[PDB]
Design a protein around this ligand. Structure first.
Ligand SMILES: CCCCCCCC/C=C\CCCCCCCC(=O)O[C@@H](COC(=O)CCCCCCCCCCCCCCC)COP(=O)([O-])OCC[N+](C)(C)C
Ligand SMILES: CCCCCCCC/C=C\CCCCCCCC(=O)O[C@@H](COC(=O)CCCCCCCCCCCCCCC)COP(=O)([O-])OCC[N+](C)(C)C
Ligand SMILES: CCCCCCCC/C=C\CCCCCCCC(=O)O[C@@H](COC(=O)CCCCCCCCCCCCCCC)COP(=O)([O-])OCC[N+](C)(C)C
Ligand SMILES: CCCCCCCC/C=C\CCCCCCCC(=O)O[C@@H](COC(=O)CCCCCCCCCCCCCCC)COP(=O)([O-])OCC[N+](C)(C)C
Ligand SMILES: CCCCCCCC/C=C\CCCCCCCC(=O)O[C@@H](COC(=O)CCCCCCCCCCCCCCC)COP(=O)([O-])OCC[N+](C)(C)C
Ligand SMILES: CCCCCCCC/C=C\CCCCCCCC(=O)O[C@@H](COC(=O)CCCCCCCCCCCCCCC)COP(=O)([O-])OCC[N+](C)(C)C
Ligand SMILES: CCCCCCCC/C=C\CCCCCCCC(=O)O[C@@H](COC(=O)CCCCCCCCCCCCCCC)COP(=O)([O-])OCC[N+](C)(C)C
Ligand SMILES: *[C@@H]1O[C@H](CO)[C@@H](O[C@@H]2O[C@H](CO)[C@@H](O[C@@H]3O[C@H](CO)[C@@H](O)[C@H](O[C@@H]4O[C@H](CO)[C@@H](O)[C@H](O)[C@@H]4O)[C@@H]3O)[C@H](O)[C@H]2NC(C)=O)[C@H](O)[C@H]1NC(C)=O
Ligand SMILES: O=S1(=O)NCN(C2CC2)c2ccc(F)cc21
Ligand SMILES: O=S1(=O)NCN(C2CC2)c2ccc(F)cc21
Ligand SMILES: C=C(C)[C@H]1CN[C@H](C(=O)O)[C@H]1CC(=O)O
Ligand SMILES: C=C(C)[C@H]1CN[C@H](C(=O)O)[C@H]1CC(=O)O
Ligand SMILES: *[C@@H]1O[C@H](CO)[C@@H](O)[C@H](O)[C@H]1NC(C)=O
Lengths: 117, 32, 309, 152
């Protein structure tokens, strides 16, 4: 605040009401009605709080998009495990005189999960 | 420091007595 | 555990469970990971795969913590999974250890009260005002809910909490556990000279001083003029800055050296010891699953345990 | 050697002696760590264990100092010991190297008062001039706020 001022019910110069408004303001202030009326009008939308100088840990807003490039690297990799599956079955044709059940019996061997064979 | 260095000393004596008394390669499976 | 938010510590921990299940599926699916063991006997259809569900999860945890593991991937397919999990855990740690500099120097405790609401509900902290003042008389003639409970406390204890002056209030804040209710232009003077004290909460009401004159004096319309003149000239602020400043108390706008201790890092010796008590429950748990499968090959699972001990 | 307190440097050094004795007991106790050597001759009851008391202590020191070692653990049991010692030494070093920035400087020993303003508000530092000089007489006949408190 640059200075300190205040409002006030203005009365003419020498009115008998300024000693009755003064009483009726000091009565409303100790009853808490001058604060009750100010909270009724000056609140409105309580526009959201600032989260000043404190910690500011890292969230999805800051780092965030590495879970994109993590998930974009795994969708790339499942395109390659298929791409290795097709280059292997193409070179399985040169010993088997292409069958296309070669790609079946190969993906049978995927379901031979036994740490071996 | 006074209590836990005794506890680590218990784990150190056991780990020596396992090391001395055991042929780690020979036949001895599943021991201690 | 602070420099990453508690949704990031859940997204990292779901990524280790995520990638290791993705790495295990691709390793069993890819035909180049199925290498042929026994190079001494290179003629048998016994091609094996080293990626278990164990070893896939301990390539995910082993590369999360910079030490690395066994089973480097051997494909164009499983090395894009492993190669992108190395770039993930590079940045997550480089974001962690570059933010942890700010969270090892720190904050302190916050007071048990923060307003007159929190101070009304507690019996643990006694509190009073000056007897025969305008602060006591405020709570005496009030009828709002919070500020009448604060007078229900004082009227029962008028020989104990209601001090006789502002100096007996400040000393009982110091020497005891006490929450003295003083007017806000005295708190601004005391809490700059003393650095032990603070102002809890905002202003309860709004009041003001004033040169008192007798009932109907001709001076109150001349003092009023001579106050409003001093206020626009800036002398009522110039006099207040001459007295209420004093020692302009800081403490902690400096934040010096502060080596780490058990107070700062401290609780990793908890999660170290909580990980070893977990592990001795598992070495027993492997002992029981082995002896249960020893009951199949042989007889008397209990004495099959006793021989190997 | 300052950014960790001298009880933490003792708790770290007891943890290396702690975990390596815990890792050596579990490795000899677990039946899956006892792998079978000689894959060229896969028929003999000569199953071995690579965790000695040497190699258990040099998985504890080798992972404490970020370089890693031989003998990655091979179990569900010895990889929870090794996996929690990797998370321990991750944080201890990340707490060390994020605090060591403050202890290679400090801010190289400045003065408590830096003007006549800071020296006026303190009673801790006494101060005076030469009696019957032109410096005393300056503060005697002054009326500016700071330089009158210094005459009070
Ligand atoms: C292996 C491959 C893995 C790939 C996975 C990750 C791939 C990326 C996954 C997700 C990315 C999500 C993109 C955000 C949305 C699109 C906008 C955009 O494209 O940005 C801009 C291009 O920015 C550039 O100019 C840089 C080019 C892209 C990076 C090069 C790829 C790295 C390949 C690695 C080589 C590997 C070999 C290295 C050695 C191993 C264009 O848009 P803009 O208008 O200029 O900016 C406004 C943006 N806004 C609209 C959002 C506000
Ligand atoms: C950041 C993004 C990635 C960038 C990286 C790019 C870098 C260039 C990447 C690869 C370059 C390849 C160089 C070949 C190696 C030379 C040796 C040789 O001649 O024999 C090889 C050819 O035998 C095969 O069966 C081919 C399989 C090779 C691995 C997969 C590549 C082809 C995938 C096809 C489909 C792709 C799908 C594409 C979809 C669009 C065999 O070698 P091996 O298989 O290793 O096994 C034997 C091991 N040994 C040799 C030690 C004994
Ligand atoms: C500066 C800090 C250094 C810390 C290092 C401490 C950890 C490492 C310490 C010692 C490592 C243990 C040695 C085992 C070696 C195996 C050899 C063997 O098979 O049998 C040997 C029996 O010899 C032993 O087994 C001695 C073990 C008993 C004492 C071990 C702990 C002493 C504590 C110390 C202080 C504790 C406090 C630690 C903290 C200060 C005899 O065989 P060999 O003649 O030796 O020939 C070997 C080759 N060959 C078998 C193939 C033929
Ligand atoms: C998912 C499908 C992947 C498949 C395999 C997964 C298996 C499991 C493996 C890993 C599991 C993944 C981690 C688990 C938790 C998810 C992370 C999270 O919570 O939020 C992340 C969501 O980001 C994503 O998860 C993907 C969203 C789609 C990507 C958008 C661009 C498309 C590029 C792909 C196509 C290119 C193809 C390749 C191009 C060469 C953060 O993003 P955000 O919150 O939305 O942003 C913040 C916005 N905010 C500020 C408003 C808050
Ligand atoms: C990537 C692998 C999986 C990761 C799992 C992640 C688990 C965490 C998930 C969520 C954490 C939140 C819930 C935990 C319980 C809450 C209690 C609490 O506040 O902390 C308490 C316990 O804290 C711990 O001990 C940590 C939990 C176990 C970690 C060690 C075993 C798992 C690591 C190996 C994983 C192998 C197992 C996996 C399968 C074989 C500590 O506080 P206190 O003891 O109550 O009081 C101390 C007194 N004092 C304050 C005065 C000083
Ligand atoms: C905190 C959790 C535990 C709490 C319990 C507390 C008390 C503990 C009580 C008992 C402990 C449990 C049982 C005792 C262990 C015996 C099992 C066993 O035999 O292992 C075997 C199989 O194991 C597997 O196949 C599964 C392992 C893959 C997942 C790894 C765990 C991480 C999951 C994350 C979890 C979710 C994370 C969510 C985080 C919020 C390992 O041996 P093998 O593979 O057969 O040998 C290789 C075969 N070979 C020789 C041919 C080469
Ligand atoms: C085979 C036996 C294996 C175990 C031992 C193997 C040897 C290990 C090797 C070395 C020993 C370990 C580290 C070195 C010494 C300890 C250092 C220390 O400071 O104490 C720490 C722990 O100790 C405590 O203070 C007790 C805390 C109670 C909970 C601890 C969890 C353990 C139970 C597991 C629960 C089951 C979980 C199951 C899964 C969920 C913490 O101290 P503090 O109290 O936080 O400090 C006070 C803080 N203050 C000053 C600010 C007030
Ligand atoms: C950190 O904060 C602590 C609590 O927040 C605080 O502890 C308080 O210390 C005072 C002493 O200064 C304790 O007072 C005692 O309680 C009775 C109550 O009747 C006192 O009468 C008594 O003697 C007083 O002591 C004065 C100073 O020694 C002295 O002027 C008189 O002799 C007077 O009679 C006791 O000393 C109080 O209960 C404590 N509060 C607690 C435990 O909650 C610490 O002082 C504070 N430390 C610092 C460095 O700031
Ligand atoms: O204009 S006033 O009557 N007199 C000046 N002041 C105080 C000197 C700040 C104030 C302070 C608050 C007011 F509401 C009114 C006045
Ligand atoms: O007691 S007063 O003279 N009149 C009432 N008020 C309260 C703002 C209502 C105020 C506010 C600030 C004052 F400085 C004085 C008074
Ligand atoms: C110290 C005393 C009695 C005075 C100080 N000013 C207040 C007043 O202006 O009446 C009183 C304190 C109070 O009631 O909190
Ligand atoms: C040595 C004395 C008393 C003299 C020297 N010149 C100043 C003068 O001529 O006033 C004084 C120093 C001072 O005031 O600190
Ligand atoms: C309160 O702060 C002062 C500094 O103004 C300090 O000297 C004192 O030790 C602190 N504590 C107590 C109990 O007075």
């Amino acid at each position: 605040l640059i200075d300190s001022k205040g409002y006030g019910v203005g009365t003419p110069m020498g009115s008998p009401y300024r000693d009755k408004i003064t009483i009726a303001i000091l009565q409303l202030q100790e009853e808490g009605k001058l604060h009750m009326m100010k909270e009724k009008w000056w609140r409105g939308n309580g526009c959201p709080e600032e989260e000043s100088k404190e910690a500011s840990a890292l969230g999805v807003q800051n780092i965030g998009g590495i879970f994109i490039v993590l998930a974009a690297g795994l969708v790339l990799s499942v395109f390659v495990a298929v791409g290795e599956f097709l280059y292997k079955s193409k070179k399985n044709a040169q010993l088997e005189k292409r069958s296309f059940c070669s790609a079946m019996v190969e993906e049978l061997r995927m379901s031979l999960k036994c740490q071996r064979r | 420091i006074g209590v836990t260095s005794g506890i680590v000393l218990v784990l150190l004596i056991i780990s020596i007595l396992v090391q001395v008394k055991q042929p780690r390669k020979k036949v001895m499976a599943c021991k201690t | 555990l602070n420099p990453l938010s508690p949704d990031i510590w859940m997204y990292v921990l779901l990524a280790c469970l995520g990638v290791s299940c993705v790495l295990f599926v691709i390793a069993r699916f890819s035909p180049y990971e199925w290498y042929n063991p026994h190079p001494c006997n290179p003629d048998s259809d016994v091609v094996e795969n080293n990626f278990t569900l164990l070893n896939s999860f301990w390539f995910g945890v082993g590369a999360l913590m910079q030490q690395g593991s066994e089973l480097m991937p051997k494909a164009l397919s499983t090395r894009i999974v492993g190669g992108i999990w190395w770039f993930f855990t590079l940045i997550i740690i480089s974001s962690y250890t570059a933010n942890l500099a700010a969270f090892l120097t720190v904050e302190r405790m916050e007071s048990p009260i923060d307003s007159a609401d929190d101070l009304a509900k507690q019996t643990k902290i006694e509190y009073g005002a000056v007897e025969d003042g305008a602060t006591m008389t405020f709570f005496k003639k009030s009828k709002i809910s919070t500020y009448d409970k604060m007078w229900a406390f004082m009227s029962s204890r008028r020989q104990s909490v209601l001090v006789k002056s502002n100096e007996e209030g400040i000393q009982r804040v110091l020497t005891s556990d006490y929450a003295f209710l003083m007017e806000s232009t005295t708190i601004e003077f005391v809490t700059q000279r003393n650095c032990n004290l603070t102002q809890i909460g905002g202003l309860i009401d709004s009041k003001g001083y004033g040169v008192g004159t007798p009932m109907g004096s001709p001076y109150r319309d001349k003092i009023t003029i001579a106050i409003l003149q001093l206020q626009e000239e800036g002398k009522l602020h110039m006099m207040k800055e001459k007295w209420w400043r004093g020692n302009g108390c800081p403490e902690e706008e400096s934040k010096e050296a502060s080596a780490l201790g058990v107070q700062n890092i401290g609780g990793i010796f908890i999660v170290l010891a909580a990980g070893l008590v977990l592990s001795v429950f598992v070495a027993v748990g492997e002992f029981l699953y082995k002896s249960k499968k020893n009951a199949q090959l042989e007889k008397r699972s209990f004495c099959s345990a006793m021989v190997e001990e």
